[PDB]
Design a protein around this ligand. Sequence first.
Ligand code: SF4
Ligand code: SF4
Ligand code: SF4
Ligand code: SF4
Ligand code: FES
Length: 574
Amino acid sequence: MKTIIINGVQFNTDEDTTILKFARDNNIDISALCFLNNCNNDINKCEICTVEVEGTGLVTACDTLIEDGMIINTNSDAVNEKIKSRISQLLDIHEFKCGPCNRRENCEFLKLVIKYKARASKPFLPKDKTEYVDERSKSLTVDRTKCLLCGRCVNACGKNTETYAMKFLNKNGKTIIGAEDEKCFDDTNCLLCGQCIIACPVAALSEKSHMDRVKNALNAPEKHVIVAMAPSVRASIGELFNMGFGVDVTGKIYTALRQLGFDKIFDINFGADMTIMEEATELVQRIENNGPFPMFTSCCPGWVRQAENYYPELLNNLSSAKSPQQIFGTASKTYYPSISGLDPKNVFTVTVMPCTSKKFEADRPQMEKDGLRDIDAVITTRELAKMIKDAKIPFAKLEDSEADPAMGEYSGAGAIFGATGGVMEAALRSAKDFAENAELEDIEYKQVRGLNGIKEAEVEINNNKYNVAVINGASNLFKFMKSGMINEKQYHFIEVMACHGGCVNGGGQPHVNPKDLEKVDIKKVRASVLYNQDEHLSKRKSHENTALVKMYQNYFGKPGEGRAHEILHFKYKK
Ligand code: SF4
Ligand code: SF4
Ligand code: SF4
Ligand code: SF4
Ligand code: FES
């Protein structure tokens, strides 16, 4: 075995990890900053993980591997001053205004300021922040007075998407981060997925706020404000109210939304059953006569932008059904005004999403019908948590309430949408029933579920064999295509999500912090809430939702045709 004494404490091990990863497992904490996603900043490291090992001296723990004769120093003095110096040097390029900062109660730099008791030199107060700020994007915002240049957003974008859309740039003499040619992210190959925000330790990267759109709508006398939350929100916002991980808070969120002043409390899972209603019918129509194959999902805006910027020839193969957000939005300006006494231009639709790319989607020019936007505002999970906290709603102690039924009811098929393989499984439950005109008992497609990057399965429909694939994350779509895996058989239906794990690990989700992220498999525990909802729901197929059936029979007619085909669809030409 190898045998090391870190700070005079005895440890023998048959593990060949780094000093930082051995220490993380063994309670002895070493501080770190640029290390994340099994990588550090290769080009000018932050050196917060400095330790000293006798004989050699000061090394960076996040990438120095343990040796059998080591004696390592953490608390030390020469180590401790090398690190505190580094933090103070970052405060020289940091605007230290915690509160009103959106990262105040979970920062991880404020935490390294009070632990090492570091102070700037000259505190950094730019009189004009314009040059540092970029807010041209519909999904992402940058404030470089908070940027530590730790390279975490660049490495996270490369691992998670492989687009390398978040780059290190040379502006004048300085190094900044941003998009291709310091352009607005929307005008580049960027997917607006937000994984760079999730990797950022500070408030340098944030979602484009839609807080004032919601605010103004709630104070506006004539506006009827509709709110509907995504599948993933109920499996994750309780993390921000110190309730833990994998806690189902569906009922608390409906109550909280009533206390914020919303007029109707609906849900995007109703919209998810609507999308399956259209898309599963479209899949049956593509199986009747030979395609076009493959039909791809078109509900993830990060993926839609990936197939626009990188695979434009696939745009025709995408499902014409609108994403749950946008299909719900079209119906909230048409169906809901006809069952309530309202004029559609006084309805304002707000969604709560685990995603920043949803903001871009809602704001797309043609995502409207004669002046009325499908969706008027999209706030992330972190933004809903902010506005609950501002109102002082005692979230953890709220009584559970139910959604308003007409557009808030949902089946278990819609419920699993927030996990990778969720849309695939939900579409197959309805597509197999529609094509064979039966009510099938077996509905679990466990083989398309889970955290494997590329999952496939063979499905039998009408005693014929069909192949389906599930692409977990945008880096895996590039691997699927470039590998020629797409060509090893004829695929009939392919689900694609841009974020790894699915929407439960989207770019608008609660931050976690690495010394917690080490302990919890966050993609699995957030997803388990949703799968448990499906398993305990009596309706587990989209077409069985009672409020959905009332809407289609009384207002849209049959799926995939006539009126349903008119307004609940969107095709991308460009
Ligand atoms: S990013 Fe962190 S350290 Fe910087 S002002 Fe905000 S809360 Fe404070
Ligand atoms: S939003 Fe996604 S594709 Fe764009 S820079 Fe961030 S991680 Fe990269
Ligand atoms: S934007 Fe955030 S993650 Fe990216 S280099 Fe700056 S501080 Fe690091
Ligand atoms: S996987 Fe979900 S959270 Fe991620 S970009 Fe797509 S729609 Fe957004
Ligand atoms: S955490 Fe090790 S050099 Fe940055």
